[PDB]
Amino acid sequence: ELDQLRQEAEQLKNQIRDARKACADATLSQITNNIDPVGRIQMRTRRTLRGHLAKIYAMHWGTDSRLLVSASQDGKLIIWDSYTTNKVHAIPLRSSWVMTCAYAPSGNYVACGGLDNICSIYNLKTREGNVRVSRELAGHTGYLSCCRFLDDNQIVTSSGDTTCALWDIETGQQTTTFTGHTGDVMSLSLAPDTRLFVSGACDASAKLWDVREGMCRQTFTGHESDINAICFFPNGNAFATGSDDATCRLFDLRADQELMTYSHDNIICGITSVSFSKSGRLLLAGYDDFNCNVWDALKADRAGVLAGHDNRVSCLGVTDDGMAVATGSWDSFLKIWN
Amino acid sequence: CTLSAEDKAAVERSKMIDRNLREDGEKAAREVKLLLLGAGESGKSTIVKQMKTGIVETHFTFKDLHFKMFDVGGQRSERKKWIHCFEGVTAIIFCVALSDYDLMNRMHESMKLFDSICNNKWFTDTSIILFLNKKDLFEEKIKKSPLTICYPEYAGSNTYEEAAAYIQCQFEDLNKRKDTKEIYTHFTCATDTKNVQFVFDAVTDVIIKNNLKDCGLF
Amino acid sequence: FMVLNPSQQLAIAVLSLTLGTFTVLENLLVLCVIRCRPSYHFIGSLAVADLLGSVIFVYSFIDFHVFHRKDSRNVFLFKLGGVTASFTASVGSLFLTAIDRYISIHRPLAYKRIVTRPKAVVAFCLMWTIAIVIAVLPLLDIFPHIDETYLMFWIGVTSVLLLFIVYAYMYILWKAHSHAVRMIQRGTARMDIRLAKTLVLILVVLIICWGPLLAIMVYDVFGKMNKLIKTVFAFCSMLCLLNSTVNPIIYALRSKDLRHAFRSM
Amino acid sequence: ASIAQARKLVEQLKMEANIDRIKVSKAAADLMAYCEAHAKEDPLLTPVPASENPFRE
Amino acid sequence: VQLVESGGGLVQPGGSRKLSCSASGFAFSSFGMHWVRQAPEKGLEWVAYISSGSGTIYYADTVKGRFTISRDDPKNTLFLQMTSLRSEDTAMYYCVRSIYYYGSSPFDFWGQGTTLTVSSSDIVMTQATSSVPVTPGESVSISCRSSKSLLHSNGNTYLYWFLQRPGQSPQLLIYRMSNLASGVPDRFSGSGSGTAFTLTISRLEAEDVGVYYCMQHLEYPLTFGAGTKLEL
Ligand SMILES: COC(=O)[C@@](C)(NC(=O)c1cc(C)n(-c2cccc(C(F)(F)F)c2)n1)c1cccs1
């Protein structure tokens, strides 16, 4: 009978709990109190981009800190020139139920996927000058929730049918499959060295995956509800999560525990996206009460607020060099700040 | 100006992009956006027939009005995380089968799902059409199987005219938004055009009431 | 001419001041909304034209009719153009909503496409320009200095605007009734009754205020003057500023959004 | 049967339980060190004058 | 990708003619188009322009009132209509696509060109070298000079280096000073500052023999230097 599982599962769970509690000497707050407060930070709308006619669901910064891409519930994918607001390319989609986009590190490829259970790959450097499709990746049985690039020939994908799978764009067949989640999977984020990636799902759990061995290694828990967005801290040895609990958290990849939490009573709605500043000193957490906040990472105090949107914020990103910030929202206006 | 002959052609391109983005953002306001729900019985297929992978979209034209129906029966994943993509639909289209009153486990499930959808925060102002299917088998089963099986508290005679019309009171009493939305019930006369003509007439009521709420006349 | 009754001169000042203060207060209350849908630019235009109509009038009127101050033929015409601009612009906004509400039910399927943010401000600005352009004619007996042609140029524009505003709402009521009849007859008395609950109020409050004034003004050209008609005109001239009082009620408070928005604000 | 899934879960737990862990206090100190070492690289922490700013106008 | 054009022939001076180019695939409906020229045994010259969507149109100081340009967007056909020709217009015409958006590479495909022979305030650029002989394997350098600075507030240096191997139409090498064209062997590069610029070829090969040109594109007028020639 399956009763023989209970004892072993209990002992291993208690062993992991005891280890994680024994390695918890002191919190991040205790040693950080000595550094000076950042004070009050003000930013202003140095630019504003217009042209989508519906809600906006994702965005990704280019690699040279000047271009970016965004996709909306209309069948439109558009690349902006962020300096002079010129539109560079506008790409018509197949299925209007869009939820993801990504920019290649070489800035040559762009990817998209939606409710049709398929992820597509586009070629920005043709000899006719117009974007074309090169591959369609099929094999999931749930909505596609995230996607990232390793290089020009390896893309990672994530779906709500509990299965994350690493692919090879050249042939079209997945060359690994990651399993272990019980519910829908919502986000993933690579490592700076491009050998790992973490993910978060509706189970209220986060799992670290070895890209090459194809096997899970570590699990992080502590959120009270579903998890919406995830980001990987710029050193490469931490990441931060955002949930529908109206709370965000910082996790560590070396001592295996939650480090810090950022929560305030005046917010009852849940976080939609999370991203980091270039020194790791700021955390720009978009929210559901129609505006975006700013949190100092080390001390958890909130420096300021960017409030220029008339609806829920859905996607934000910090540039590669550190100049600016961009945010999108369901009101169809992308605003560049600085 | 302070623009070179290069950068002065990188703004004509960005204008010529919008001159084609708008011409195709207004073409998408001439179509009617209808959702569909219910159990996956045979009713759906016949309904699509008489109107002539993860999402299936059907289109049909009738009296110069184009509808598009997003049958979401192919997803089978957690509903709370993709339902809001369908905000701003014109009208829902429900589906119910009469014959399943005794199989009364099926009836309670349909009632529970009707209750669950109606009070969503994303669907406060959407008009719910409701169809009713399998009258032919219902009238033959009721002649031997009493309605007391599904509803023991039925104090009525259980005659055919007094039986089939008892369900609608229980269906349309579930609405908690009487002042904003209304059920437009029907009996599926599968042999004639009244299946789709009823939808055509039932859409204009809410179109007009929404116009009369926008201009302020209400 | 300066014909007046001193007892009336003392009595009517309080009424005029009350009407002006009510107009100003309610017009600021309406214009505080700046919701922001294309049809509400017209009600904003009404709210500001009714403001410009109140303060100008209450300055000249008593001044002429309590302690007399005179002006030359090149100044009184300018002041009268300054008071006429507001009143020819106010009735332009009442004609601004009504055409929108007519096309709301005339073409229910196409309404949300025709009216757009650029299409609102263009008519707004053109109407205010034409309203201010009334001063052109003075370049080319109840009023001290006005010639004959002005009292026949103004009557036509006001008459046609009020005629259109009268027709459109009866049209809307008839079509609402017919649609509700065809709905109840085939699909089986709420829409058209809820429309007639207020459209009769609109067409009653509008014509009554601007009936007597355009009656007597027409009588002047088509008849002969007398000391009696001047006395009645002296106090029936208040009907314009009485009408300006009601528009911030019957047009703004009628809409279900704003009545709750003000309390939520 | 589900016994295979039971063994699989036990094996995953056995893999995950044995990993080595460092003190959390020492892991915290590395974060502040990186922050201080790269503070000067951050246009959002220390604002720049409007001359070299590329989004000026 | 192809560009093909036809027409030309013998023309009585003062007459009228037309030249047209056909694009194969290539989405001719999205590319700003020029028509660049060169006289027999002379440097490259410039004629006309037509932007995307039949809008912006510029002209040279000599062609302003004689020729008209147009694109048949539906059928992907580009025209230039000629009136009142003289002896000064006998030359070759080279349809040249271009792509103006951030990060692009203008002037990166020449058509095959067409022969036309008649019957019988601008930034100046110069380069003094001509027919210099060098043995292969050794490094070489070429330089042309500008009458005014080409660097800009935006930073781009609007100088181009093209190559015309004998018998062939030009092909882009250096679309801006620090940037080269794809499909070209890596051995070429370029450097320069201020108002003076110099080209370098690292490892001379058999096919590098040909004439070079340099172009300025700082503002509208488009001026070409002389034709330097390398020799084996
Ligand atoms: C006799 O005048 C007046 O003493 C006053 C108090 N004005 C009125 O009493 C009055 C009342 C009305 C309705 N109008 C009016 C409005 C628009 C056009 C015309 C006309 F005559 F040009 F057609 C007349 N003027 C004013 C004197 C100076 C500024 S106002």
XYZ file of C-alpha atoms and ligand atoms in Angstrom, chain C residues 57 60-61 64-65 76 79-80 83-84 87 142-144 146 150-151 154 217 237 240, ligand 1:
51
model
C -25.339 90.210 -19.052
C -24.700 95.772 -18.698
C -28.346 95.178 -17.833
C -28.302 100.515 -18.248
C -31.417 100.185 -16.085
C -22.493 100.162 -27.690
C -20.799 95.675 -26.099
C -23.943 94.231 -27.690
C -23.282 89.932 -25.034
C -24.639 88.334 -28.236
C -26.013 83.659 -26.325
C -36.021 98.388 -27.766
C -32.251 98.263 -28.328
C -30.747 101.769 -28.389
C -29.292 98.322 -33.437
C -29.651 92.409 -37.229
C -33.054 91.572 -35.695
C -30.516 86.588 -35.528
C -38.815 90.460 -30.973
C -35.662 89.546 -20.906
C -32.432 83.690 -21.184
C -31.178 97.112 -24.654
O -30.209 96.129 -24.434
C -29.684 96.130 -23.137
O -29.903 97.036 -22.407
C -28.836 94.954 -22.664
C -29.023 94.740 -21.173
N -29.225 93.779 -23.410
C -30.509 93.113 -23.323
O -31.390 93.482 -22.623
C -30.668 91.901 -24.227
C -31.416 90.747 -24.039
C -31.214 89.961 -25.146
C -31.839 88.591 -25.389
N -30.393 90.606 -25.937
C -29.876 90.201 -27.225
C -29.089 89.076 -27.369
C -28.609 88.733 -28.621
C -28.905 89.522 -29.720
C -29.682 90.652 -29.563
C -30.015 91.527 -30.761
F -30.754 92.591 -30.342
F -28.859 91.973 -31.328
F -30.723 90.801 -31.669
C -30.166 90.993 -28.318
N -30.043 91.797 -25.393
C -27.355 95.170 -22.955
C -26.703 96.425 -23.167
C -25.218 96.194 -23.433
C -24.920 94.795 -23.395
S -26.275 93.973 -23.075
